[PDB]
Amino acid sequence: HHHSGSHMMPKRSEYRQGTPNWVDLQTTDQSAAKKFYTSLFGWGYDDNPGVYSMATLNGEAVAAIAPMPPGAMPPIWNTYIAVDDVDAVVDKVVPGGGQVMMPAFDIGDAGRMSFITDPTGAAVGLWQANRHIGATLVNETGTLIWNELLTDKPDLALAFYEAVVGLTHSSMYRVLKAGDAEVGGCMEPPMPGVPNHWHVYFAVDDADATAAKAAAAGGQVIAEPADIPSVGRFAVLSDPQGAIFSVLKAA
Ligand SMILES: OC[C@@H](O)[C@H](O)[C@@H](O)CO
Ligand SMILES: [Cl-]
Numbered sequence: 518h519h520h521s522g523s524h525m526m527p528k529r530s531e532y533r534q535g536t537p538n539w540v541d542l543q544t545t546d547q548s549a550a551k552k553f554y555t556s557l558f559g560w561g562y563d564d565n566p567g568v569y570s571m572a573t574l575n576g577e578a579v580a581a582i583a584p585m586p587p588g589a590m591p592p593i594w595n596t597y598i599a600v601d602d603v604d605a606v607v608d609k610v611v612p613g614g615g616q617v618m619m620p621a622f623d624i625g626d627a628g629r630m631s632f633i634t635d636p637t638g639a640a641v642g643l644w645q646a647n648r649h650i651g652a653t654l655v656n657e658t659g660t661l662i663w664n665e666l667l668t669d670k671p672d673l674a675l676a677f678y679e680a681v682v683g684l685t686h687s688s689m690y691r692v693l694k695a696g697d698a699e700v701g702g703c704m705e706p707p708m709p710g711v712p713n714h715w716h717v718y719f720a721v722d723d724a725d726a727t728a729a730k731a732a733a734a735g736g737q738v739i740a741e742p743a744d745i746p747s748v749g750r751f752a753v754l755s756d757p758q759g760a761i762f763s764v765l766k767a768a
């Protein structure tokens with residue numbers, strides 16, 4: 518890991534524990550990644566001292582792009598889940614059958630985080646906010662719309678998130694809940710050779726158009742645009758550096 522009123526706009530100023538709160542990209546070429554994600558999503562950036570490049574859209578923080586640490590590596594989109602007391606949560610990880618990959622530490626005055634794996638090996642950050650809460654805009658076009666745990670052992674994984682952050686779920690595909698709020702999903706991965714991981718979806722107006730634009734911008738279409746019944750339409754894409762993520766047009 519690199520750190521080593523119902524109709525209102527979906528602004529966020531707070532995250533309940535268990536809610537995915539943030540995604541960031543660690544990459545081999547920050548400059549190039551910036552241009553690519555601008556091409557797809559229209560992001561601007563605020564560089565903060567390497568440099569952590571905060572992606573912005575309509576005056577709101579939506580994600581970030583970070584440089585790699587030493588060692589080697591394929592670029593990756595990281596997911597973070599909000600927690601009230603990261604130290605307390607971390608204390609439950611090993612008893613719950615997971616691993617603490619990166620022990621808890623303070624990131625400037627942004628917050629405090631740990632990087633863990635669940636018992637199925639899917640990695641996720643635990644984020645205790647100080648100055649930085651996470652995304653201040655979600656769901657809208659160009660922003661984070663869904664976080665999905667792709668794992669070959671959903672119930673085992675989800676028992677762990679219940680024990681450690683209090684996430685519950687219901688089946689319909691598993692929809693994850695932090696209290697009464699739906700905050701993400703979980704299912705078995707699409708193909709052999711896909712590691713268990715937290716998958717990142719950004720909202721788009723037209724999955725097909727975005728997929729075409731991705732290829733034209735030097736990325737790759739990993740899974741061509743396809744419909745998910747009653748949900749909408751998605752494509753799985755790679756940026757030109759190799760980082761995989763999906764785009765979703767919701768119906
Ligand atoms: O519960 C708060 C979350 O931000 C939800 O509004 C998003 O839809 C999760 O994807
Ligand atoms: Cl470039």
Ligand SMILES: [Cl-]
Nearest residue numbers: 732736737738
């Ligand atoms: Cl392609």
